[PDB]
Amino acid sequence: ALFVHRDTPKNNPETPFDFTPENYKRIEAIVKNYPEGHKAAAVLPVLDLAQRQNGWLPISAMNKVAEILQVPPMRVYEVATFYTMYNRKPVGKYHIQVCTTTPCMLRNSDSILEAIQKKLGIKVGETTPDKLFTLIEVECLGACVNAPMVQINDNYYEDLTPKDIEEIIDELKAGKIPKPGPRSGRFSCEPAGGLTSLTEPPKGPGFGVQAGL
Amino acid sequence: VNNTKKWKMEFDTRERWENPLMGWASTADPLSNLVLTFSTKEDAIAFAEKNGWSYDVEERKVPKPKSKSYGANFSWNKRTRVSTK
Amino acid sequence: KTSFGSLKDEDRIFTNLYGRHDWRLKGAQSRGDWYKTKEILLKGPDWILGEVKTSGLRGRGGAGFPTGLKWSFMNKPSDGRPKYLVVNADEGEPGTCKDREIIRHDPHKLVEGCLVGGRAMGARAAYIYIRGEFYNEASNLQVAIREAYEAGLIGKNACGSGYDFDVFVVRGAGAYICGEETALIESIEGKQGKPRLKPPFPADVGVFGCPTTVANVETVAVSPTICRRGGAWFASFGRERNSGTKLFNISGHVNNPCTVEEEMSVPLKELIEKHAGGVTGGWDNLLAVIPGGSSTPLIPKSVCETVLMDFDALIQAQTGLGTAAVIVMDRSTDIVKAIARLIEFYKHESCGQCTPCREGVDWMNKVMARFVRGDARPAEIDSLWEISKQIEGHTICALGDGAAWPVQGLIRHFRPELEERMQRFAQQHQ
Ligand SMILES: NC(=O)C1=CN([C@@H]2O[C@H](COP(=O)(O)OP(=O)(O)OC[C@H]3O[C@@H](n4cnc5c(N)ncnc54)[C@H](O)[C@@H]3O)[C@@H](O)[C@H]2O)C=CC1
Ligand SMILES: Cc1cc2nc3c(=O)[nH]c(=O)nc-3n(C[C@H](O)[C@H](O)[C@H](O)COP(=O)(O)O)c2cc1C
Ligand code: SF4
Ligand code: FES
């Protein structure tokens, strides 16, 4: 929650970070997506790649991204503190993000925030003592018709009840990985009581194509 | 820049010493606080010559016209890119 | 045509919206995607821009700028810099979840839109700046882009037309402000997502300082269907200057919250009572509707009865169409808590660059947090109004406008509920 760095023994510029060689090949593929002379444009993916390897960002991943992209380190610190995904503290193995903006709040995200809190025994911002679950409270995740919903590390868990999110935390603690989908009867975003549209077969290639084409 | 609009006539500073009682800045210069204000340079020169004061004149230093462009912060190939904003 | 809506399934552009068909290349080619794309590209930039200008397509990102007039700004001879179409797939707007559906279920439609739009604007490559939270959607789109490269549809000699065109995907990292087009351009360039001032518009100095058009996923993915079906087919829907179809996200207090493709000038009551199953507790349980996602001001139940869901009828309803994200709020809603949570969103999602947003959106959030409890006096309503008018139009991008406008709509339609909140605070605490 702070935006200055203080050197701790676990977060200092001599904390060991280095990319794996397959991550260096991934970084070469990232840098080749941008014009020559604008290698700095690969700050945001490569830094996120540093978060996908290490789980979070000590200030040697920031220094390594600054060093291999030849940008100043402050230009990486600005990116790491601007964007809300770069974990500058080590989060748990499952990073639960509960959306509590108004479309998810109107469909009772508070009940699911409370159910996660009384299932995990923590509150918002805390980590469980076994380092498995970090519960925070995020803004809109772009799944508004699937309100209420959470995100766990890559995955959207949608149309949730307190019982559904208790079941999801149960099968996360059991080592398995749950299905990233709506826990209600529907599949992605359709009306729940049957399709109100798109009930016809699609017309296929060439339908309605104008003349002169 | 509202103080750079007018011409000023000051004088050479003389000795300011420590008052033995209080440490105050004692002076013997009557013209120590005398700053005269003129609209042009020639008015100040005519007033200095009228009163017999040997003067010297510095010329008015304006800032030169700069070339500004907000798009120049984001050039394709020039060094004038900003790396932060 | 005086009545609108009831769009037929043969007129849907976004078939396979719901994920019920194969999103991959075999599924997309049997729904009409990548059909005669070479014949579209070989008719040149001017024909495609004429089809988009003829269709009356307005920018689906939320502002509704005329899309063909926008894309014609790139139609100019080069000067050594490359040209870039950049696709805005960030979609941070509360209420809005439609571009996620296009990327997740119709990705080849977006890729063919990238090719057709970039041919129209002479663009060398496409950057699809996708939201970082949409990881599954971004990998989904990357699999579709791999299928498009292996079919020869993009890349070197795209569709056998002799036009070379790459399609890149750039993931965001958790900023709503990186949906704004110049802040998105700064976010692609490896910097903080702070909006550039305008001018230069991105067609002059855009991504990497090149000519660049940023366009929404929805206004890009409809463009090959416009070029195949004709601009007159697209313009035959909706009212005049409000042409075409639109994806709508009905969320909040409806029985069936859903994304649905509908004709443009459909009534709001018809849209809710047809595709969403009505307001929870019936239409008489309706308190307010935010018509187009968080930045548009709310409208009360008396305005929702007759209004049409296009740009012009909602500007006449002193709100905006926005992203066509219909948030429905029933009579049991604490509306000051909802609007204050929305302003709390706007201060957590504000980059901090210019003074009125950086200071005034936090100060509006503090005033709204006192308004929820009633911990205020009624002279602070009008003050807050003026605070909104000091942010509106004084900032760099329209996030300052998008934070002023819910405050203004809440005050304008629900001043007495604020006043009774404050006076019951004043009688139970003094
Ligand atoms: N889709 C979403 O997730 C979100 C959408 N919005 C919507 O976005 C809108 C505000 O966005 P803005 O881009 O600031 O709106 P608007 O002021 O800028 O301009 C719309 C588009 O037209 C272009 N344009 C306008 N005048 C031009 C000119 N003279 N020359 C060249 N290009 C020109 C701009 O570059 C821009 O791409 C609002 O209506 C808001 O509701 C807001 C937040 C989120
Ligand atoms: C704060 C802010 C956030 C925005 N976010 C998005 C967005 O997430 N997606 C989008 O398509 N447009 C967004 N816009 C609108 C863009 O500025 C721009 O108009 C649009 O992305 C491209 O224009 P188009 O509507 O013709 O596609 C946003 C605007 C602002 C001010
Ligand atoms: S008004 Fe807010 S969102 Fe826009 S440039 Fe300023 S700080 Fe950024
Ligand atoms: S409001 Fe929770 S996902 Fe958009």
Side-chain angles (χ1 to χ4, degrees), chain A residues 99-105 139-144 147 149, chain C residues 93-96:
Chain A
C99 177
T100 57
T101 54
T102 299
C104 287
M105 184 183 70
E139 304 298 325
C140 173
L141 294 178
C144 307
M149 55 81 61
Chain C
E93 184 66 10
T96 304

mmCIF file of all heavy atoms in Angstrom, chain A residues 99-105 139-144 147 149, chain C residues 93-96, ligand 4:
data_model
loop_
_atom_site.group_PDB
_atom_site.id
_atom_site.type_symbol
_atom_site.label_atom_id
_atom_site.label_comp_id
_atom_site.label_asym_id
_atom_site.label_seq_id
_atom_site.Cartn_x
_atom_site.Cartn_y
_atom_site.Cartn_z
ATOM 1 N N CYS A 99 -14.515 -8.378 -6.860
ATOM 2 C CA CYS A 99 -14.967 -7.124 -7.441
ATOM 3 C C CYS A 99 -16.131 -6.568 -6.637
ATOM 4 O O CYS A 99 -17.135 -7.254 -6.432
ATOM 5 C CB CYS A 99 -15.377 -7.323 -8.891
ATOM 6 S SG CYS A 99 -16.010 -5.822 -9.562
ATOM 7 N N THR A 100 -16.001 -5.323 -6.183
ATOM 8 C CA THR A 100 -17.039 -4.678 -5.389
ATOM 9 C C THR A 100 -17.452 -3.340 -5.978
ATOM 10 O O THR A 100 -17.902 -2.457 -5.249
ATOM 11 C CB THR A 100 -16.594 -4.481 -3.944
ATOM 12 O OG1 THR A 100 -15.391 -3.709 -3.929
ATOM 13 C CG2 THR A 100 -16.380 -5.813 -3.242
ATOM 14 N N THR A 101 -17.321 -3.165 -7.290
ATOM 15 C CA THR A 101 -17.943 -2.011 -7.913
ATOM 16 C C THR A 101 -19.447 -2.219 -8.011
ATOM 17 O O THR A 101 -19.974 -3.291 -7.710
ATOM 18 C CB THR A 101 -17.356 -1.742 -9.293
ATOM 19 O OG1 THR A 101 -17.442 -2.928 -10.085
ATOM 20 C CG2 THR A 101 -15.932 -1.310 -9.174
ATOM 21 N N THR A 102 -20.129 -1.165 -8.459
ATOM 22 C CA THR A 102 -21.588 -1.097 -8.371
ATOM 23 C C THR A 102 -22.348 -2.208 -9.110
ATOM 24 O O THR A 102 -23.307 -2.726 -8.515
ATOM 25 C CB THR A 102 -22.040 0.310 -8.802
ATOM 26 O OG1 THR A 102 -21.463 1.280 -7.923
ATOM 27 C CG2 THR A 102 -23.549 0.463 -8.767
ATOM 28 N N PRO A 103 -21.981 -2.665 -10.324
ATOM 29 C CA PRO A 103 -22.703 -3.829 -10.877
ATOM 30 C C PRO A 103 -22.524 -5.120 -10.096
ATOM 31 O O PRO A 103 -23.466 -5.916 -10.034
ATOM 32 C CB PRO A 103 -22.143 -3.950 -12.298
ATOM 33 C CG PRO A 103 -21.728 -2.611 -12.634
ATOM 34 C CD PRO A 103 -21.175 -2.031 -11.388
ATOM 35 N N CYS A 104 -21.371 -5.350 -9.475
ATOM 36 C CA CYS A 104 -21.234 -6.518 -8.616
ATOM 37 C C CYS A 104 -21.721 -6.269 -7.201
ATOM 38 O O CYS A 104 -22.099 -7.220 -6.512
ATOM 39 C CB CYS A 104 -19.784 -7.000 -8.582
ATOM 40 S SG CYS A 104 -19.259 -7.799 -10.098
ATOM 41 N N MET A 105 -21.739 -5.013 -6.756
ATOM 42 C CA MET A 105 -22.272 -4.708 -5.434
ATOM 43 C C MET A 105 -23.790 -4.831 -5.411
ATOM 44 O O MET A 105 -24.367 -5.269 -4.408
ATOM 45 C CB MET A 105 -21.845 -3.309 -5.008
ATOM 46 C CG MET A 105 -22.274 -2.934 -3.609
ATOM 47 S SD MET A 105 -21.830 -1.252 -3.189
ATOM 48 C CE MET A 105 -22.965 -0.393 -4.261
ATOM 49 N N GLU A 139 -11.480 -3.473 -8.297
ATOM 50 C CA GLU A 139 -12.475 -2.709 -9.023
ATOM 51 C C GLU A 139 -13.070 -3.610 -10.105
ATOM 52 O O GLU A 139 -12.943 -4.833 -10.028
ATOM 53 C CB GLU A 139 -11.836 -1.426 -9.548
ATOM 54 C CG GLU A 139 -11.207 -0.579 -8.449
ATOM 55 C CD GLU A 139 -12.194 -0.092 -7.404
ATOM 56 O OE1 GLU A 139 -13.354 0.201 -7.744
ATOM 57 O OE2 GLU A 139 -11.805 -0.007 -6.222
ATOM 58 N N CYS A 140 -13.758 -3.019 -11.085
ATOM 59 C CA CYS A 140 -14.481 -3.762 -12.112
ATOM 60 C C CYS A 140 -13.561 -4.654 -12.921
ATOM 61 O O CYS A 140 -12.505 -4.214 -13.374
ATOM 62 C CB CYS A 140 -15.203 -2.794 -13.042
ATOM 63 S SG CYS A 140 -15.945 -3.615 -14.445
ATOM 64 N N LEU A 141 -13.958 -5.914 -13.083
ATOM 65 C CA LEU A 141 -13.160 -6.902 -13.797
ATOM 66 C C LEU A 141 -13.721 -7.232 -15.168
ATOM 67 O O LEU A 141 -13.246 -8.174 -15.804
ATOM 68 C CB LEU A 141 -13.031 -8.181 -12.974
ATOM 69 C CG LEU A 141 -12.233 -8.036 -11.682
ATOM 70 C CD1 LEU A 141 -12.203 -9.334 -10.907
ATOM 71 C CD2 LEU A 141 -10.834 -7.555 -11.965
ATOM 72 N N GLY A 142 -14.705 -6.474 -15.639
ATOM 73 C CA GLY A 142 -15.269 -6.709 -16.950
ATOM 74 C C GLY A 142 -16.117 -7.952 -17.065
ATOM 75 O O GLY A 142 -16.164 -8.559 -18.133
ATOM 76 N N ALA A 143 -16.791 -8.353 -15.994
ATOM 77 C CA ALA A 143 -17.686 -9.504 -15.992
ATOM 78 C C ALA A 143 -19.000 -9.131 -15.326
ATOM 79 O O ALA A 143 -19.497 -9.811 -14.428
ATOM 80 C CB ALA A 143 -17.042 -10.695 -15.299
ATOM 81 N N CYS A 144 -19.573 -8.018 -15.776
ATOM 82 C CA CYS A 144 -20.605 -7.327 -15.014
ATOM 83 C C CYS A 144 -21.951 -8.032 -15.081
ATOM 84 O O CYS A 144 -22.724 -7.966 -14.122
ATOM 85 C CB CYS A 144 -20.726 -5.905 -15.532
ATOM 86 S SG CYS A 144 -19.141 -5.091 -15.545
ATOM 87 N N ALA A 147 -22.125 -10.831 -12.541
ATOM 88 C CA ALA A 147 -22.064 -10.415 -11.154
ATOM 89 C C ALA A 147 -22.874 -11.372 -10.288
ATOM 90 O O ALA A 147 -23.941 -11.836 -10.704
ATOM 91 C CB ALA A 147 -22.612 -9.001 -11.003
ATOM 92 N N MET A 149 -18.763 -11.843 -8.943
ATOM 93 C CA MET A 149 -17.685 -12.675 -9.446
ATOM 94 C C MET A 149 -16.387 -12.324 -8.743
ATOM 95 O O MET A 149 -16.238 -11.243 -8.171
ATOM 96 C CB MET A 149 -17.539 -12.539 -10.968
ATOM 97 C CG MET A 149 -17.353 -11.124 -11.522
ATOM 98 S SD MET A 149 -15.686 -10.442 -11.451
ATOM 99 C CE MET A 149 -14.821 -11.621 -12.471
ATOM 100 N N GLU C 93 -14.789 -0.234 -18.007
ATOM 101 C CA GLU C 93 -15.976 0.485 -17.574
ATOM 102 C C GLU C 93 -16.885 -0.415 -16.749
ATOM 103 O O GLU C 93 -17.224 -1.516 -17.196
ATOM 104 C CB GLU C 93 -16.703 1.010 -18.809
ATOM 105 C CG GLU C 93 -17.947 1.883 -18.628
ATOM 106 C CD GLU C 93 -17.701 3.236 -17.975
ATOM 107 O OE1 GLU C 93 -16.550 3.666 -17.794
ATOM 108 O OE2 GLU C 93 -18.691 3.929 -17.704
ATOM 109 N N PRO C 94 -17.252 -0.008 -15.533
ATOM 110 C CA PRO C 94 -18.228 -0.774 -14.750
ATOM 111 C C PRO C 94 -19.574 -0.827 -15.450
ATOM 112 O O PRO C 94 -20.116 0.195 -15.874
ATOM 113 C CB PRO C 94 -18.302 -0.001 -13.431
ATOM 114 C CG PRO C 94 -17.006 0.706 -13.344
ATOM 115 C CD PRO C 94 -16.652 1.077 -14.748
ATOM 116 N N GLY C 95 -20.096 -2.038 -15.585
ATOM 117 C CA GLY C 95 -21.240 -2.315 -16.400
ATOM 118 C C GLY C 95 -20.897 -2.978 -17.716
ATOM 119 O O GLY C 95 -21.706 -3.747 -18.238
ATOM 120 N N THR C 96 -19.715 -2.704 -18.258
ATOM 121 C CA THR C 96 -19.376 -3.074 -19.624
ATOM 122 C C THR C 96 -18.605 -4.387 -19.632
ATOM 123 O O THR C 96 -17.557 -4.500 -18.989
ATOM 124 C CB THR C 96 -18.560 -1.967 -20.287
ATOM 125 O OG1 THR C 96 -19.288 -0.738 -20.214
ATOM 126 C CG2 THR C 96 -18.322 -2.293 -21.740
HETATM 127 S S1 FES D 4 -18.581 -4.528 -11.865
HETATM 128 FE FE1 FES D 4 -17.710 -6.358 -11.043
HETATM 129 S S2 FES D 4 -17.030 -7.004 -13.023
HETATM 130 FE FE2 FES D 4 -17.652 -5.041 -13.771
#
